[PDB]
């Protein structure tokens, strides 16, 4: 009932290709590819071909893909063979296999039969690179770009080789020196390399209460404040009733109590039809009036 033991049961059905076959299939793929492009190019060129030859090239295309799929299906074992070695690193086996199959696909598209090298020679590169590149892109819950995954792993080896040389874990300076970067950089790198923990994990230790329900929502409304805030609004409203009508309007608009949007002096003056400087002069007199003890003592506590 296992999923992988089925895939292995099917790919083994195909027979591996000898050295001579790889070349033959490779020929058919290139011939079909050009023949298909040749036809499409003629329509642009407003040209025609022998009706009989045109039907021949049309069949060439059909034959090229059969070789293309047959070439893939024969080398699937190679993808699995390389995929075995990268398990447990945070990617499921099947995922590694499929990504490897993607590399295999490009190996076929870029293979060159004229160079006379066995296919598995040039396919291993693309298959290997496909799997690793995939891990850097997917293995981490918080995706880290490839270049950063690259440096993190280098910092790991530098730390491992330095670990075995010094009989102790080297500090940021040595790690920085050996790596030719600033220690503050290696610190920023070591923060990036952290992987998250599971909230669903149970940390009850006698009590079976998961980690999740232990986080304090900091944005949740504070009960006392939303009330004292409504009481501050009321206290301010009454304090403004002492000011002049024009006066209260300016202070409101300047801070945006009524419309929630602060206003530049120019904007305030445009609604009252006065210069922007006068608006500044008004605020000053009314800040000193609001600084008068009668209106303020109440507000200091708030």
């Amino acid at each position: 009932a296992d999923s992988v033991r089925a895939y292995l049961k099917q790919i083994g059905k195909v027979a591996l290709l000898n050295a001579e076959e790889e070349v033959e299939l490779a020929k058919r793929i290139e011939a079909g590819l050009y023949a298909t492009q040749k036809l499409a190019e003629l329509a642009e060129k407003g040209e025609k071909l022998p009706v009989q030859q045109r039907r021949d090239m049309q069949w060439i295309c059909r034959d090229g893909d059969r070789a293309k799929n047959h070439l893939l299906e024969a080398n699937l074992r190679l993808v699995v063979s390389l995929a075995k070695r990268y398990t447990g690193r945070g990617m499921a086996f099947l995922d590694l296999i499929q990504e490897g199959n993607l590399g295999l696909i490009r190996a076929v598209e870029k293979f060159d039969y004229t160079k006379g090298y066995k296919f598995s020679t040039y396919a291993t590169w693309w298959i290997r690179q496909a799997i690793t590149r995939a891990m850097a892109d997917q293995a981490r819950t918080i995706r880290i770009p490839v270049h950063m995954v690259e440096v993190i792993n280098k910092l790991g080896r530098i730390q491992r080789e330095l670990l075995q040389d010094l009989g102790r874990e080297p500090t940021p300076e040595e790690l920085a020196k050996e790596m030719d970067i600033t220690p503050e950089k290696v610190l920023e790198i070591q923060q990036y390399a952290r992987e998250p923990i599971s909230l669903d994990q149970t940390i009850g230790d006698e009590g079976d209460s998961q980690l999740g329900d232990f986080i304090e929502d900091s944005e949740a409304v504070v009960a006392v404040d939303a009330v004292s805030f409504t009481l501050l609004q009321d206290q301010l409203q009454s304090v403004l009733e002492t000011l002049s009508e024009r006066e209260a309007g300016v202070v409101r608009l300047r801070f945006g109590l009524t419309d929630g949007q602060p206003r530049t002096l120019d904007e305030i003056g445009q609604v009252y039809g006065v210069t922007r400087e006068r608006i500044r002069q008004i605020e000053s007199k009314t800040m000193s009036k609001l600084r008068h003890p009668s209106r303020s003592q109440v507000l200091r506590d708030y």
């Binding site: 020929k27 011939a31 590819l33 023949a35 030859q53 021949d56 090239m57 060439i60």
Partner: protein, 88 residues
């Protein structure tokens, strides 16, 4: 204070996206459908220089010159023409 713009996806579904009035509306919008939609207004200016993805033909072409391909096709065609009546 908001102006409403409509976008049409490829499948024909239309979406209303409320924007603020004092800003410039886009011509395409990532919609609730998950598909790009085009505004039904006048512009709709540009496609933003979409570039063609690399294809198998591009990879083949840059290793084989078109003459090498023509000969390989001649090999294949002469092979085909062998079974048309030719040899038996």
């Amino acid at each position: 204070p908001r102006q409403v713009a409509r976008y049409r996806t490829d499948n024909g579904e239309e979406f209303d996206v409320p924007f603020a009035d004092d800003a410039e509306i886009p011509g395409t919008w990532l919609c609730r459908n998950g598909l790009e939609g085009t505004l039904i207004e006048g512009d709709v200016p540009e496609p933003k220089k979409v570039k063609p993805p690399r294809t198998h033909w591009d990879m083949l072409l840059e290793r084989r010159s078109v003459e090498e391909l023509e000969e390989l096709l001649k090999e294949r065609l002469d092979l085909i023409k062998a079974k048309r009546r030719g040899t038996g």
